[PDB]
Amino acid sequence: KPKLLNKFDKTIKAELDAAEKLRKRGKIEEAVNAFKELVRKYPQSPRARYGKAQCEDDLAEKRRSNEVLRGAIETYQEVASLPDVPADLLKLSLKRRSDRQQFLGHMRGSLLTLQRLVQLFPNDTSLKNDLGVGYLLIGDNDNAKKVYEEVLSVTPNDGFAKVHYGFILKAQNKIAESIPYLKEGIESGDPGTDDGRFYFHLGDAMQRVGNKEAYKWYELGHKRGHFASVWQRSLYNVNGLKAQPWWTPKETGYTELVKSLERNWKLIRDEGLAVMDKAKGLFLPEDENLREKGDWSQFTLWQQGRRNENACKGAPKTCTLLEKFPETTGCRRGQIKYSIMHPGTHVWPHTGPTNCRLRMHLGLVIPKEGCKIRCANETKTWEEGKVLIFDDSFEHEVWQDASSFRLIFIVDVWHPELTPQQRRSLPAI
Ligand SMILES: C[C@H](CC(=O)O)C(=O)C(=O)O
Ligand SMILES: [Mn+2]
């Protein structure tokens, strides 16, 4: 039902459908030459020009070629330069241009295309919504906010506009205000609203204002395929890995590493305390997004399988100990770090990025009351010289309500069901 042919193109239809059928057949290189061999013969036609670009676009996905695709992006532009081009075709070509610009990371180039589209079609709500995304992708939340406010003033129940507006409010620290927008947008069911990122932000906003319905939305997100379960919501996952929030050492099979950590725990503690005492600047403030209140810092020895040489000069015996255990030093999706937390601290519920690791905590200095960690529905506490093991792809939350500082040692390990070849080939995050 789209109209892609001006007065001209209608005359040469039998040819245009030929070059088109070649592409639908998958015989791409000929559609290209076919189309390419029609502008020299049919320079003025939009639909012929559009066809050449569609071919380049397809050749690009086939050949995995950015260079090819850059060619398509210009030919899509050429379509819009010709006379009496039909609105439906103008819109198709520039929209695809913007999308492929965005694919290459030409985010401001895409924004300029989308600005053009809105000038051409000042009443197409869909295109304003896309323009707002263009402003978000260059980091310009203020202009995106104005775009969606415009959309909502004309079409107040557009769910796409609502979920993006809620996201923008949340990023501006209007957390409570974002929630009804996210909810209503998701509930509209409109195209582009059934997106795990809006379930993520809705659930996070609700948890951060004490609303217990967050878990209803995580569960809905799960049923919609955005989360592994109501509790396990990491983004970068491998299928088939045992999924439980708390593990015993025997269950992980890394019993020799647990033994080494527990049996040498005072040395690990003492090296951490020495760095605290002498080089306290080496403890870096933890994730400010996750820290509701308090004072929480970390001193990293390994990051994604890469040893920090300057840090291992501060904790040399501990680094030496760990070098025996590639299940953690070679965990490209994990970290090895000391983690200190002072009284009055609360870490918001969150998950880690991957189900490919397990997270070990060795207790080094644990006040006798006040410190606890929840993973999923079970809350536990640390002990000096003992390891706890949890799957941090499950939601977890930490409180420090003691009267002195709490020091732990955090050791990530590859999930034990990952094969050697999987461990070798997984990208770091
Ligand atoms: C809050 C905790 C760390 C800590 O308790 O120092 C956490 O999120 C984690 O181990 O992943
Ligand atoms: Mn965490």
If you measure from the C-alpha of residue 119 to the centroid of ligand 1, how many angstroms do you get, rounded to a whole number?
A: 49
In this structure, the number of other CB atoms found within 10 A of the CB of residue 225 comes to: 9
What's the sign of the alpha-carbon dihedral 201, 204, 210, 211? positive
CA dist., res. 377 & res. 321, Å (int): 34
What's the sign of the alpha-carbon dihedral 360, 364, 365, 368? positive
Task: Give the single-character DSSP code of 224.
Answer: T
Collapsed DSSP state (helix, strand, coil) of residue 240 = coil
Resolution in A, one decimal? 1.8
Which one, of 40, 33, 5, 3, lies nearest residue 19 by Cα?
A: 33
Helices marked H in 224-323 — which ranges? 249-252, 255-263, 265-278, 309-314, 316-322
Query: What are the angstrom distances between the C-alpha of 234 and each of 6, 11, 376?
Result: 50, 55, 13
Residue 127 CA to its chain's centroid (Å): 24
**Residue 322 burial by CB count (10 A; 0-12/13-18/19+): exposed, middle or buried?**
buried
CA dist., res. 91 & res. 355, Å (int): 42
Task: Give the CB-side neighbour count of residue 190, counting CA atoms within 13 A.
Answer: 18
Which one, of 197, 194, 195, 218, lies nearest residue 206 by Cα?
A: 218
CA dist., res. 17 & res. 26, Å (int): 14
Residues 6+ apart with CB under 8 A from 160: 129, 185, 190, 191, 192, 193
CA dist., res. 385 & res. 261, Å (int): 8
Using an 8 Å Cβ cutoff, are 362 and 408 in contact? yes
Residues 6+ apart with CB under 8 A from 427: 332
Q: Which ligand is nearest to the CA of 352?
A: 2
In this structure, the number of other CB atoms found within 10 A of the CB of residue 284 comes to: 10
Q: Give the tokens for residue 309.
A: 């040489």
Using an 8 Å Cβ cutoff, are 75 and 56 in contact? yes
Residues 6+ apart with CB under 8 A from 406: 340, 341, 342, 365, 366, 367, 371, 382, 400
Q: Which ligand is nearest to the CA of 294?
A: 1
Q: Give the tokens for residue 361.
A: 């905590």
Residues having CB closer than 6 A to ligand 1 are 339, 341, 347, 359, 392, 396, 398, 408, 410
Name the residue of 289, 364, 372, 396 whose CB sits within 8 Å of the most ligand 1 atoms, as the mutation to test its pocket.
396
What's the sign of the alpha-carbon dihedral 148, 149, 153, 159? positive
Pairing assessment for the beta strands 357-365 and 306-307 based on DSSP bridges: unpaired
Pairing assessment for the beta strands 357-365 and 387-390 based on DSSP bridges: antiparallel
If you measure from the C-alpha of residue 335 to the centroid of ligand 2, how many angstroms do you get, rounded to a whole number?
A: 11
Element (H, E) at 130: helix 125-137
CA dist., res. 107 & res. 368, Å (int): 53
If you measure from the C-alpha of residue 243 to the centroid of ligand 2, how many angstroms do you get, rounded to a whole number?
A: 16
Using an 8 Å Cβ cutoff, are 267 and 253 in contact? no
Which one, of 283, 286, 345, lies nearest residue 315 by Cα?
A: 283
| Residue given tokens 């409570």 in the structure block | 176
CA dist., res. 204 & res. 196, Å (int): 12
Which one, of 266, 257, 277, lies nearest residue 317 by Cα?
A: 266
Q: Give the tokens for residue 140.
A: 């310009």
C-alpha Rg value of the chain to the nearest Å: 28
Which experimental method was this entry solved with?
Answer: X-ray
Which one, of 120, 171, 170, 124, lies nearest residue 147 by Cα?
A: 124
Question: What are the residues facing 396 on neighbouring strands?
Answer: 350, 375
CA dist., res. 354 & res. 328, Å (int): 15
Residue 396 CA: nearest ligand 1 atom is 8
Where are the extended beta strands (E) located within 106-192?
Answer: none
CA dist., res. 335 & res. 298, Å (int): 11
